[PDB]
Homo-oligomer: A and B are copies of this chain.
Amino acid sequence: KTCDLVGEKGKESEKQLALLKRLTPLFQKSFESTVGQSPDMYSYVFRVCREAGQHSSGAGLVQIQKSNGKETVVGRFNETQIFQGSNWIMLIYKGGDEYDNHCGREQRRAVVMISCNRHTLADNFNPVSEERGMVQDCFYLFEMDSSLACS
């Protein structure tokens, strides 16, 4: 019912479990941000290791078309990767819904850069961009502030 790590198990995997544990106070929260202009107005909902979608799909981050509440899963938390930088944490959710035309029809993916901010536990979640111009390895990029990424 929480984040599941993907990758090789070992010393590094063990460190990533520790990072997820540190983010526990954020689990109960839900972050949202609406961007874009009609007919492409989108609302992104992001959560840390908890269901961010409306259909129990295991979504960690979803995209909702404002015009018509169509929900698209950007990434699932059962496919998480996480890394600790000096003043930030990079959180990745793979296994989102598949593209039909772009990116070799691969599953969508979310990359969230959580930067250190001593003033708040969590705030300023914002979509940065969607890299959908590659034949593979595409991603939706986001940012958010959190004191938990600080040294």
Which of A's residues lie within 8 Å of B, judged by CB?
Answer: 6-8, 12-13, 81, 83-88, 90, 113, 115, 124, 126, 128-129, 131-134, 136-137, 141, 143
Q: A12-B129, A113-B113, A129-B12 are in contact. Are A7 and B134 (CB under 8 A)?
A: yes
User: Given A113-B113, A115-B115, A131-B81: A143 and B86 within 8 A (CB)?
Assistant: yes
Which residues of chain B have C-beta atoms less than 8 A from A6's C-beta?
133-134
Evaluate contact between B85 and A141: CB separation under 8 angstroms: yes
Each complex incorporates copies of this chain amounting to 2
Asked if residues A12 and B133 are in contact (CB atoms below 8 Å), the reply is yes
- Contact: B128 with A113, CB < 8 Å? no
Give the Cβ gap from A34 to chain B, nearest Cβ, in Å. 17
Cross-chain contact of A141 among B83, B126, B133 (Cβ < 8 A) = B83
The distance in angstroms between the C-alpha atoms of A85 and B126, with both chains bound, is 9
When chains A and B are docked, how far (Å) is the Cα of A126 from the Cα of B126? 26
